Design a protein around this ligand. Structure first.
Ligand SMILES: CC(=O)N[C@@H]1[C@@H](O)[C@@H](O)[C@@H](CO)O[C@@H]1O
Ligand SMILES: CC(=O)N[C@@H]1[C@@H](O)[C@@H](O)[C@@H](CO)O[C@@H]1O
Ligand SMILES: CC(=O)N[C@@H]1[C@@H](O)[C@@H](O)[C@@H](CO)O[C@@H]1O
Ligand SMILES: CC(=O)N[C@@H]1[C@@H](O)[C@@H](O)[C@@H](CO)O[C@@H]1O
Ligand SMILES: CC(=O)N[C@@H]1[C@@H](O)[C@@H](O)[C@@H](CO)O[C@@H]1O
Ligand SMILES: CC(=O)N[C@@H]1[C@@H](O)[C@@H](O)[C@@H](CO)O[C@@H]1O
Lengths: 149, 150
């Protein structure tokens, strides 16, 4: 499956900063309003719920910056080519969030309900409406799609 | 496609057709029972994103509210039936650990016990609590969660 990662409260989407089809390692993941093929994602299942969030255009995957196992609050999210267990996430399409292996969630930095374009994404333990995400068709940004297949 | 056991989280019992047949009759009740064997394996056939059919692997019959109504009341029994239609849609919530019908009620053991005895019937009920939690596990390791959506 190929999908968009849509911030529920704002309707903005996860992008590599700059929108490249081949972002460098450690490129930040931001929120931005635009839809294009360089903000499509895939999900590579590794173990049941756990897997890699894959930037479709480049094949790089989402990491906490630095690849720490138990990233603290405010750790930036980036793309990197490496595959390892510290880049495992789950796509909770029931509670509408993205959870890292060590139990924190993807947030817009600052936790706004309407983050501006280019807002950084970070890890944070809190749960609230401004950390919800839904996973939608590139063809219809309101149509949820199953990311596990 | 993924084959799995439907395990009542609190008790460790599993969903079975009552009687354990490879070919249960239509409207056979779904019960909880401790045994593990190929006649209590399930599969999930995705229809629309989260929604799909919970399929008894041996027979090909799927889980329905008895009588097949769109918005079944509390205490509606769960059964197997061959028919495929939109009143037999469920989602396998492997994050909250529950089985939810399209109209919003959950699979429960009748009475809501943490340790239901073997042969306890399953029903639909809107309440949420620990005794309506289910996990979806490997036939080869009843403690290993498996992805049912594949
Ligand atoms: C014109 C152009 O490529 N625009 C993109 C935009 O669509 C978005 O992807 C953004 C993310 O930081 O990077 C660029 O500015
Ligand atoms: C050597 C080493 O630890 N490499 C990791 C790399 O694997 C990736 O996780 C990256 C994410 O920012 O952080 C580090 O550079
Ligand atoms: C009080 C408040 O809004 N807190 C939020 C917190 O919940 C989390 O979303 C964080 C992400 O950077 O941004 C804020 O600090
Ligand atoms: C020997 C045998 O298949 N026994 C089964 C048991 O395993 C269980 O499936 C039960 C469910 O009502 O039906 C039978 O008693
Ligand atoms: C004619 C009619 O409603 N048939 C339904 C059938 O499709 C199935 O849903 C069954 C489940 O117990 O309930 C009824 O018999
Ligand atoms: C126990 C209790 O107060 N309520 C439960 C309810 O939550 C549900 O589990 C139902 C299923 O038949 O069994 C009881 O009525």
């Amino acid at each position: 499956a190929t999908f968009l990662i849509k911030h529920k409260a704002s309707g903005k989407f996860l992008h590599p900063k700059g929108g490249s089809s081949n972002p460098a390692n450690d490129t930040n993941l931001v929120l931005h309003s635009d839809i294009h093929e360089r903000m499509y994602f895939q999900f590579d299942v590794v173990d049941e719920r756990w897997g890699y969030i894959k930037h479709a255009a480049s094949g790089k995957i989402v990491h906490p910056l630095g690849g720490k196992a138990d990233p603290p609050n405010e750790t930036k999210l980036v793309l990197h080519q490496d595959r390892h267990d510290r880049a495992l996430f789950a796509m909770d399409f029931f509670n509408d969030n993205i959870i890292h292996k060590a139990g924190k969630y993807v947030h817009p930095k600052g936790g706004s309900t309407n983050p501006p374009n280019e807002t950084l994404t970070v890890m944070h333990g809190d749960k609230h409406g401004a950390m919800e995400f839904i996973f939608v068709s590139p063809k219809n940004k309101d149509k949820r799609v199953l990311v596990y297949v």
